[model samples]
Target: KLQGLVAATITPMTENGEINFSVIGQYVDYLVKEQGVKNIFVNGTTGEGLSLSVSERRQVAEEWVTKGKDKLDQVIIHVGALSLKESQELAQHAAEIGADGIAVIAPFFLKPWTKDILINFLKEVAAAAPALPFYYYHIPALTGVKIRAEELLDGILDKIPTFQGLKFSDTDLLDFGQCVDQNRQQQFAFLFGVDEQLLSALVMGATGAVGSTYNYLGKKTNQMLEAFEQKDFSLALNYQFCIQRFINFVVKLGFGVSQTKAIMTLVSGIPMGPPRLPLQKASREFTDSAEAKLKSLDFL
Candidate 1:
């Protein structure tokens, strides 16, 4: 099962909007040696998976899997595509490339209006990678799929035998808690995705987490996890607050993958390049001020 802070990695790009394959090796090492993060979720929202062409996505997945091989614990590839065939093809590719797991977000453009259709869609994708663990990426706010995660978890395994867990990105703790409580008998990894309120989800029984901020804030977040495990509530709270402070500051500056990539470059000291087109590059002013904020919060 997936555990700990799984960094939702950003796809490194050159200034000309090409994939910076050269930096991926450095990114893998940075996460392992510097950030103490071993697990990664590639080609997700942060990675700009959908924006990339199918071939580009495949290359990115292979690059990450290749670079992360022995150094990383898990490389969960997101294979959710607008076309079912494309998603299935990506799932097969992930399996062939030796990915630890695969995640599928609900198709956003032609949204799954009901749980039945959604399950069917997931089943097809999971069947392609039957051996790999399948995780549902339930980010309702982004996908506009209003199906509650609690409702989705009800008898999900029977539909998709390889189903393992969820990347619960929604903010509804009520639904998230019910998913955990109801699936208590099963060994499902309920990885919370919202970074700002991760501590709240821990109280509701999140086994671990997957988030973009963990790319840079991982060492600190891991400390928070340790504190929580050691029953140091106050200490954990302080860690969570520190994270929230940085996140809160960024959110106010119109945060997105662009801003996230910029912050990553600053903290990691590795040139993350730029985000893909449609998502513009962050301004110098934003990066400078964000750096100041992190330094002030003791994150630098």
Candidate 2:
């Protein structure tokens, strides 16, 4: 298990909306060389994995696994689907393709209400890739499975044999803090997901983080982590505040998967084209405004 920014990367596509697997090399280079984010968390919320077909997801997993082999420290693929069978298929694919680990989100449509149900569901998927490290992706805002992660984590090690830690995306500071307390022995790697609330999570003992913003802002966030490690509270706060101000602007500008790609292209100069259907492409005007706001924050 590694720490630091594990960028939940965007699924780059062509202008006509096909997965452009070619740009992935550049993507890996940009993250490792430019952004300084060594780890990759693909096919998750940021990558719009649910919106894509199963074949499409497998192609993505293959591309990332093959391309990021020696260049990246870790490449964790999200093998979460509504169906247990589908999730298992993906888990097997990930393991076969040699992914670093696997994460499964609770089924949102037919959600498991109790911890036992959720853990069992996760355990089922994890069993497919028994050798790989497994993580429970707890993003309630999207999954609609509002079970407290802390409570759900009770005896998880025994229930799910490969269970490692969590990718906590919720904003409940107290809940995240308690989860940290549960790992006082430094057993699991709790990767924080809420980008704007990273400082809050870091204060609560987050070992690493996964976020879309890190695609462009990894260096600054890494600086924040360094500042915290150096005990420079004021410097860390300054970095956190800067991130909040920028994210607030984008939230008002209807930030979504499409807008995120647009902004990432603007910052990285990587031409990370449009998103898939149902998610409309961001207009030039919107992206211009986004670039302006990012520039104001010295992000560009």
Candidate 3:
């Protein structure tokens, strides 16, 4: 099971808007030595996986899994795509490259209307990599498929034998709690995705978390987890607020992958060049104030 903080890592890019393979090695080192993040969920929404080509996604998967082999504990590759064959191909490739696990987000363009169809789609994808653990990436806000996770978990293991967990990214803790409560007998990892509300999920029995903010705020968040385990609610509350303050400040200024990349670049000293087209890079005016906000929060 994926426990503790697992960073939904961003893909480093060059000034010319190409994947910077060279920076990944340094990124692995920085996450281990600086942020204390041991596990990574690569090529997810934060990594702009859907925005990349299949070939590009394949290379990114291979690079992260290869560079993260020894230093990282688990490298969960996101293999979801608009095309079933493409998703299957990526899943098979992930298995070949020896990824720790694979995650599949629902197809957004042709969204599944029911839990049955979504489960069948997942089963087909899981079939390609029968040996690896499978995780359903449930982010209805992005996928436009409003199927409750509790409904999806019904008979899911019977269909897909390797089903392991759900990356619950939605805000409805009731649905998340039901998924956890129903699957208590199984050794499934219920990884929460929203960073600011992670403490709430922990209270509801979340095993770990996956979020973009963890790329920079991992060490601080881990302290929150430790405090929670020790039953120090006061300290844990303060830690959550400290993280929420930065997120709240940035959300007003339009935070997304581009802004996230900018913040990561400033904090990690890694150049995370402009995002792909249709998603503009953050302005200097925006980044300057973000730095000021972080400084005020004692993050810089």
Candidate 4:
């Protein structure tokens, strides 16, 4: 099973709007060497993959895989794209670089109908990189393609041997639980995509989590994971509540990749570039309020 917290890293950008490979290397080192995090996810929603060019996305994935191979145990690269060709190229690139797994969101803008369309899309991408493991990322709020776990299994799993897992970001824990229960022993794994639901998902048999907040809150997240392993439900709930409050605060400040990038810059001293066009930066007041909330949590 693909279990454990994976950091959905932010793509650092230079002042002139180019990706800063040096800072990205530093961020990877901090997550792996300093925090001892086992898994690293690059070029996802949190990484602003959609905002980057195809070449930029591929470069980020390759660099992350190359830099993190020796230090981290697993790396999952998100290769979501509207164009099938670009997505397939990225999947091939990720496999060539030795990434442990690849994830892709349903094609946005196109809003495909029927399971056949979605399955064909995923299957084609999987075929492009046959050797790599594949996980379908379900974030319907952003992609507008709502895929329940059962449909995914029935549509894609029977055909694609590499379809091994899911990254579920929706709020419905019961559905996530059902999905986990359905495929617990099979090759399939379920990762709770929302940070606030981590403890509940774990109780319901989720393998682990992948979240943007995991970057700054790695230590506390690790504590929660340990509590769950020890069967200390009360302590685990407490930690989950704390993370939930923080997540709420973040949502209130702003949504989308910008808020996460801002939080990482504030807490970790990593220079996260602004979210791409139309996704404006959080207002100064929002940033100040966020810092105050962090102080209340003793994070400052």
Candidate 5:
């Protein structure tokens, strides 16, 4: 099962928009050696996977596996793509490089007709890398093709044994509960995708969480997770409230790809480059205000 706070890491980039492999290694070192992070999620939403080309995505995965092999064991490579061929290539590359697992979002543009299509997509990818554990990433707001709990069980469970778990970002508690209760098998882990809902999901049977915010606030997140495990609800709630308020501030200040990068830059001295194309840069005022808030919250 996927346990502990899995940091959805941001890919540091150079000023010229190239992936900075050196900085990535340094960041990984900081996370594993200093912050006590257990698992790492590379090239996910926070990593700007969509903004990169297919080759760049594979290179990022290769670099991560190469650098983090001995230092970190559980590395999940997110291979989210709209095309089947690209996704299959990414899965194959992850398997080639000895990544621990692979996670993928639904085909974003096509929007399949039935659950069978979704199941087949996963099956095809699994067929490419049969040895690696596969996770279905549910970020409906971004992907537009939503996979309900029943659909996962009815469609992919029997067909693909590697279909091990889900990375859920949607805040529907009832649906999350159903997913956890229904998929009660030992291998079927549910990772909470939203940082703000970590405690609630843990109470509802989630095994762990994969969050972008954790890249900056991993220490507090670790504390919150431990508090919940120790049944210290008061302390857990304190951390949870801080995370919620920070997230609220992010949302109020126009949260998106750029905002997350800005926040990461503010906390760590590393620049996550810039959001690709149409994603406009966050206003200077937004970054200034967020930095002040981070200081006030003692995040620095």
Candidate 6:
């Protein structure tokens, strides 16, 4: 059963603006030990995967696979890239590094013209690493692709034999609900990606969730998941509303990789240095302010 929380971890970097590869092991211990999060989706939008070079991405995949042996239940590497060749190469590398699964976002530039085009593109990438489970990372806002995930799911298994499920970051509950309804076998993981909308997604039959907030809020958020699983709607709503309280606060503070890194640093004491260039670094004052906001919640 593909249920529970999965953190789309940020790429830890150094003050000198370089990826800090050594800190990955510590990161693994932090999430698994403190947050009770065993699954990680590395190098997604959260990880700034597209900003890093192929070599850097490979090193990250290698580090996670090397360190997460017994500590993690799953290590899913993001292999999405604008270049089809590059994406395939990363997929091949993820398999070599022994990651449990791989996810790919649609190329933002030169977007696919239709669902068939997108599916065929995915098929090509999946073929590179046929041994691993593959997930379609559907984030239309970022990709500017309006194709509904429900439409994309049609005959996807036949096209991409290794297809497992979707990391849906959109907010179309109607479409999301239909996707769940179609997958009656429950073999697919419909990981809700918009963390704040998790309660709504659960009502739509979300199997699990994948998002940035789960990095720190996971252990606490598990209460919401358990409450919902046990059919306690009121208890679950309370938990979700509490989570939204902080999420809304950070969002107003402009939560991106930079701000997110700062928040993680304060909460985990793991220095998550600056995001890659163009994305400004979050200052201490701003992040500390966010920390205080999170502390406002009783369970937090």
Better of 2 and 5 by TM-score: 2
Could you give the candidate ranking by lDDT, starting with the highest? Answer: 1, 3, 2, 6, 5, 4
> Over the full model, what C-alpha lDDT does candidate 6 score relative to the true structure?
0.89
- lDDT tens digits by residue: candidate 6, 178-263: 89898776399999999997999998889899989888888778889999999999999999998999888878877887787777
lDDT, model 3? 0.92
For model 5, what is the alpha-carbon lDDT of residue 236? 95
Per-candidate local distance difference test: 0.94, 0.89, 0.92, 0.82, 0.83, 0.89
lDDT value, residue 31 of candidate 4? 85
Q: How many residue pairs clash in each candidate at the backbone level?
A: 0, 0, 0, 0, 0, 0
lDDT of 1 at 18: 87
Worst 10 residues of 3 by lDDT: 270-279
Candidate 5: tens digits of C-alpha lDDT, residues 1-300: 668888888877777778888777877877776567878998888888878899999888888888787787689999868888988999999999999999988887988677787888878987788989999888889878766754566546678878888888888878888888876654677899988778999898888899888778888888898999999999999999988888888788788777888888778777677777666667899999898888888887
Error of 3 at 122 (Å): 0.7
For candidate 4, report its TM-score. Answer: 0.95
Clashes of 5: 0
Model 5 lDDT on a 0 to 1 scale: 0.83
In model 6, which runs have C-alpha deviations exceeding 4 angstroms? 298-300
State the lDDT of candidate 4 residue by residue for 70-147, as single tens digits: 777788999879999999999998888888999988898888897788888999998888978999888888888776
Question: What is the per-residue lDDT of model 3 for residues 1-300, given as tens digits with 9 covering 90 to 100?
Answer: 678889998988888888988899889888988888999998998998888899999998899999997899999999999899999999999999999999999998988878888888999999999999999999999999988998898789899999999899999999999999999888999999999899999999999999999889988899999999899989999999999999999999999999999999999898878899778999999899999999999888
What is the per-residue lDDT of model 2 for residues 1-300, given as tens digits with 9 covering 90 to 100?
768899998999888888999999999999999889999999987898888888999999899988897899999999999989999999999999999999998998977878888888999999999999998899999988888888888778887878888999999978888898976763888889999979889988999998999999998998998898888989999999989999998898799888988888899998888888788889888888888888889998
* Estimated TM-score for each candidate: 0.99, 0.97, 0.99, 0.95, 0.96, 0.97
lDDT of 5 at 275: 73
Q: What is the Cα-based lDDT of residue 290 in candidate 6?
A: 87
**lDDT, candidate 2, at 290:** 87
